[PDB]
């Protein structure tokens, strides 16, 4: 069948993806620029990720369409148009890893987060990451390429000139680079590190939510131990543990000041052998628990639930990046490791390439569906 027919479907789909990738990701950058509630370190990496996706639409997709023609080109020029998408994918990986680490620092050390993670340090990391992405993605232009062994028969059959080759990705980019360096070292290892970071985020949230519920239950159990106590020493023992737990957990500041103070009043009575007076003093702790401690617990639980929801949204984007790119990397593994296997057919290569590009369309949707602040800002931009 005429090659222009199958190429026409692939090209049209690529162009449709390029349009959506630019539109949705420009909307993400617009929302962050306009709304100060979206201007935070996590979202500076989100914008770096959206910039990489805009460049997939503007440059990587036109370059993929160009390569698909097999046009005559100087081998090192062909190599640049083949490798530029690897720069963008690498930058995306560094942005996804930075978002995961950012979310881990926020849940593991919230009191140190604002002094450790600043906009200035974030902008420096993003700049370094873009430089490293160019170094990794354009490593073949440093000599790890097949330009020293051109397919001269294919070049002559196409009427190419001297120093020119038929420009095809797998003719100029070495497959040992694609599998060992690009896939295993530069993609799979950071994705596995991201999985490890997300497991630590969810374990930290789970442990912190369990600790809030345990401290609340301990307060209520110790209040009952005091109510049923048969002597001053038993009231004292339960109060000494209540005081330590209260200090460990320490209008919310006023509530904890009242709580420790009331435990201290009861403990002083219990040390004087005044059981009944110590038990009546301990009952006052219920008023403080109802008016202050319960509100603290509900707010701390709600804050942890919002961090779990946010880390899930971030993990879904990292997982969707893995889902969209893995097929092309896996096809490269078959081409490389199985020279006795027929190469994956051209229609399957086009499908894997288009699926990898579709990753540049999906993040604006995940932000709109899962993040209220982005959802409302997108609605305001599209309306105004
Ligand atoms: C800032 C942005 C918009 C600028 C983009 C510049 C792009 C389109 C330029 C920069 C380098 C260029 C390549 C350099 C060399 C060659 C080899 C030649 O035999 C065919 C064209 C080809 C393959 C060029 C295609 C266009 C190219 C990729
Ligand atoms: C990441 C998730 C979605 C899994 C993706 C798995 C895909 C990429 C796998 C599953 C089955 C695989 C195919 C199984 C058999 C062959 C025949 C061989 O001659 C060329 C490779 C080819 C055609 C494989 C290409 C990759 C393949 C299509
Ligand atoms: C955690 C997951 C996503 C990591 C990725 C797994 C990759 C590296 C695995 C999944 C299936 C594997 C392939 C399965 C079958 C074959 C055919 C054999 O003749 C050569 C090795 C080869 C081509 C394997 C290479 C590695 C492979 C592509
Ligand atoms: N094997 C492979 N091929 C490509 C790639 C990139 C752009 C265009 C084309 N193309 C066009 C027509 N036929 C092929 N192929 N990319 C990759 C790749 C990038 C990242 C991981 O694998 N692999
Ligand atoms: C080949 C074309 C150039 C390729 C590299 C382009 C890199 C563009 C990067 C932009 C991401 C910026 C994200 C926001 C940075 C933080 C802002 C701030 O806190 O001041
Ligand atoms: C901020 C914008 C960044 C733009 C891209 C920067 C990197 C461009 C890469 C250049 C590699 C140059 C390779 C030249 C090869 C010439 C041919 C040969 O030596 O045989
Ligand atoms: C979207 C699915 C189609 C993507 C492009 C594959 C075209 C394959 C072909 O018809 O040769
Ligand atoms: C966006 C879709 C534009 C399609 C234009 C024609 C492409 C083609 O058939 O080569
Ligand atoms: C690429 C497009 C990115 C869009 C966001 C920047 C211009 C700013 C105007 C204003 O602040 O009023
Ligand atoms: C393709 C290039 C995309 C450009 C990206 C820059 C967008 C800037 C929007 C976020 C600004 C954040 C801030 O000023 O703090
Ligand atoms: C908004 C700017 C970015 C988008 C630009 C789109 C340009 C058109 C898309 C495809 C790239 C051109 C393909 C040229 C193939 C040459 C084939 C040949 O020489 O045989
Ligand atoms: C900026 C937008 C760029 C759009 C086009 C992408 C690059 C196309 C390169 C085409 C090279 C054709 C050379 C030739 O015909 O020999
Ligand atoms: C969009 C306009 C068409 C882009 C593709 C031009 C090159 C087509 C081809 O020769 O296969
Ligand atoms: C051939 C390998 C060349 C490696 C270096 C190429 C140039 C890399 C620079 C690209 C972008 C620089 C940083 C821009 C984002 C800053 C965000 C604030
Ligand atoms: C660490 C990241 C460093 C990135 C910058 C690297 C600098 C050296 C790049 C050398 C490129 C020379 C062109 C290659 C060629 O012409 O064959
Ligand atoms: C991760 C480790 C990958 C090692 C691959 C070895 C393949 C081989 O030796 O043929
Ligand atoms: C290859 C695995 C890629 C995983 C990326 C991160 C997924 C995060 C999910 C955590 C549970
Ligand atoms: C664990 C993470 C994944 C590691 C995967 C390694 C794949 C190695 C495949 C080696 C194929 C060799 C085929 C041959 O001997 O001909
Ligand atoms: C992520 C999960 C990865 C998915 C698994 C990838 C491949 C699975 C099927 C492997 C078997 C293919 C054998 C082909 C043999 C042949 O063609 O001779
Ligand atoms: C939606 C449908 C997606 C189908 C894609 C992948 C499944 C496996 C297809 C393998 C076809 C190539 C086999 C071969 O001819 O060697
Ligand atoms: Na991306």
206 phi and psi, to 5 degrees? -60, -45
User: CB count, 10 Å around CB of 1?
Assistant: 5
d(CA 34, CA 376): 12
- Dihedral Cα 37, 95, 18, 336, nearest 10 deg: -160
- Nearest 10 degrees: Cα torsion 270, 276, 278, 282: 140
Structure tokens at 178: 């694609």
Q: Whose CA is nearest to atom 6 of ligand 10?
A: 29
To which H or E segment does residue 164 belong? strand 164-166
Residues with beta carbon inside 6 Å of ligand 4?
Answer: 64, 67-68, 85-86, 89, 169-170, 178, 328-329, 332, 349, 353
> Residue 55 has which token pair?
């460049």
> Contact at 8 Å (CB) between 162 and 61?
no
Instruction: Give 38's DSSP letter.
Output: G
What is the domain range of residue 252? 209-299
With CA atoms as reference, report the closest residue to 245 among 203, 297, 295, 287.
297
Give which of 157, 173, 177 is closest to 75, Cα–Cα: 173
- With helix as H, strand as E and coil as C, how does 186-206 read? HHHHHHHHHHHHHHHHHHHHH
Judged by its nearest atom, the ligand closest to the C-alpha of residue 48 is 5
Ligand nearest to the CA of 338: 3
Rounded to the nearest angstrom, the gap between the alpha carbon of residue 123 and the centroid of all alpha carbons in its chain is 17
Q: What is the largest CA-CA distance in the chain?
A: 105
383 to 144, 367, 376, 377, 379: CA distances (angstroms): 50, 18, 10, 10, 6
Distance in angstroms (rounded) separating the CA atoms of residues 10 and 5: 9
Among candidate residues 47, 23, 46, the one with its CA nearest the CA of residue 318: 46
Contact 262, 226 (CB under 8 A): no
- Which atom of ligand 19 is nearest the CA belonging to 326? 1
Q: What is the resolution of this structure in A?
A: 1.8
Write out residues with Cβ below 6 Å of ligand 6. 76, 134, 138, 141
The number of residues making up the chain comes to: 384
3-class SS string, 231-245: CHHHHHHHHHHHHHH
Task: Show the CA angle centred on residue 241, arms to residues 237 and 247, nearest 5°.
Answer: 145
b/e sequence 180-206, b meaning 16+ C-beta within 10 Å: ebbbeebbeebbeebeebbeebeebbe
Pocket perturbation via mutation, ligand 11, pick of 66, 68, 72 by most ligand atoms within 8 A of CB = 66
> Is the distance from CB of 29 to CB of 57 less than 8 angstroms?
no
The token duo for 316 is 């879904």
Cβ of 280 less than 6 Å from ligand 14: no
- Residue 127 Cα to ligand 13 midpoint, Å, equals 34
Quick check: CB of 330 below 6 Å from ligand 19? yes
HSE on the CB side for 304, CA within 13 Å? 21
Q: CA 85, CA 76: separation in Å to the nearest integer?
A: 15
- Sign of the Cα torsion 77, 83, 88, 91 reads negative
- Are the C-beta atoms of 53 and 25 separated by less than 8 Å? yes
Experimental technique used to determine this entry: X-ray
Q: Which atom of ligand 1 is nearest to the CA of 58?
A: 3
Q: Tell which residue, 118, 100, 313, 97, has the closest CA to residue 201.
A: 100
φ and ψ of 109, to 5 deg: -135, 65
Q: How far apart are CA 201 and CA 291, in angstroms?
A: 32
Residue of minimum CA distance from atom 9 in ligand 5: 48
Q: Which of 64, 80, 83, 138 to mutate to test the pocket of ligand 1 (most atoms within 8 A of CB)?
A: 80
CA of residue 133 to ligand 7 center, whole Å: 29
Distance of CA 255 to the CA centre of its chain: 37
Rounded distance between C-alpha atoms, residue 27 and residue 101, angstroms:
25
* Ligand sitting nearest the alpha carbon of 6: 7
Nearest ligand by distance to the CA of 147: 6
Judging by beta carbons within 10 Å of its beta carbon (0-12, 13-18, 19+), is residue 248 exposed, middle or buried? exposed
C-alpha distance across the termini of the chain, in Å? 49
Give the Cα separation of 139 and 86 in Å (integer).
Answer: 10
Query: Please, what sign has the CA dihedral across residues 350, 355, 357, 361?
Result: positive
Cβ atoms within 10 Å, residue 383: 6
Phi-psi domain of 143 (left: phi exceeds 0; alpha: psi -120 through 50; beta: other): left
Whether the CB of 15 sits within 6 Å of ligand 8: yes
Ligand nearest to the CA of 184: 16
Per the listing, tokens 């320490």 go with 250
Placement of tokens 């902008």 in the chain: 123
Q: At residue 146, what are phi and psi to the nearest 5 degrees?
A: -100, 20
d(CA 199, CA 136): 27
| CA atoms of 200 and 349, how far apart (whole Å) | 36
CA 134–ligand 15 middle distance (angstroms): 9
Sequence-distant (6+) residues with CB within 8 A of 296 are: 252, 255, 256
Which helix (H) or strand (E) segment holds residue 74: the answer is: strand 72-74
Q: How far is the CA of 162 from the centre of ligand 1 (A)?
A: 18
Q: Going by C-beta distance under 8 Å and a sequence separation of 6 or more, which residues neighbour residue 369?
A: 375
CA distance 117 to 41: 7
Instruction: List the CATH number of the domain containing 289.
Output: 1.20.120.10
């Amino acid at each position: 069948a005429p090659p222009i027919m199958g190429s026409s479907v692939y090209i049209t789909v690529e162009l449709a993806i390029a349009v959506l990738a630019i539109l949705g990701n420009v909307l993400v950058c617009w929302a962050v620029w306009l709304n100060s509630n979206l201007q935070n370190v996590t979202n500076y990496f989100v914008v770096s990720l959206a910039a990489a996706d805009i460049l997939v639409g503007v440059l990587a997709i036109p370059f993929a369409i160009t390569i698909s023609t097999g046009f005559c080109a100087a081998c090192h020029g062909c190599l640049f148009i083949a490798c530029f998408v690897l720069v963008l994918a690498q930058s995306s990986i560094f942005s996804l890893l930075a978002i995961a680490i950012d979310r881990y620092i926020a849940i593991a050390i919230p009191l140190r987060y604002n002094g450790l993670v600043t906009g200035t340090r974030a902008a420096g990391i993003i700049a370094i990451c873009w430089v490293l992405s160019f170094a990794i993605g354009l490593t073949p232009m440093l000599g790890w390429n097949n330009c020293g062994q051109p397919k001269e028969g294919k070049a002559h059959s196409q009427g190419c000139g001297e120093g020119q080759v038929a420009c095809l990705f797998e003719d100029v980019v070495p497959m040992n680079y694609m599998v060992y360096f690009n896939f295993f070292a530069c993609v799979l290892v950071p994705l596995l590190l991201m999985l490890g970071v997300y497991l630590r985020i969810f374990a930290a949230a789970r442990r912190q939510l369990a600790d809030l519920e345990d401290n609340w239950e301990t307060l209520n159990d110790n209040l009952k131990v005091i109510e049923k106590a048969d002597n001053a020493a038993q009231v004292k023992d339960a109060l000494t543990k209540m005081r330590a737990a209260a200090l460990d957990a320490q209008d919310f500041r006023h509530g904890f000041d009242i709580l420790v103070g009331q435990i201290d009043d009861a403990l002083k009575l219990a040390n004087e052998g005044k059981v009944k007076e110590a038990q009546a003093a301990a009952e006052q702790l219920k008023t403080t628990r109802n008016a202050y401690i319960q509100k603290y617990l509900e707010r701390a639980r709600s804050t942890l639930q919002k961090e779990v929801h946010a880390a899930k949204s971030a993990a879904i984007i990292a997982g969707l990046f893995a889902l969209c790119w893995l097929p092309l990397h896996i096809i490269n593994c078959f081409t490389f490791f199985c020279p006795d296997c027929s190469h994956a057919p051209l229609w399957l290569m086009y499908l894997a390439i288009v699926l990898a590009h579709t990753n540049s369309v999906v993040n604006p949707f995940i932000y709109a569906y899962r993040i209220r602040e982005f959802r409302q800002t997108f609605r305001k931009i599209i309306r105004s």
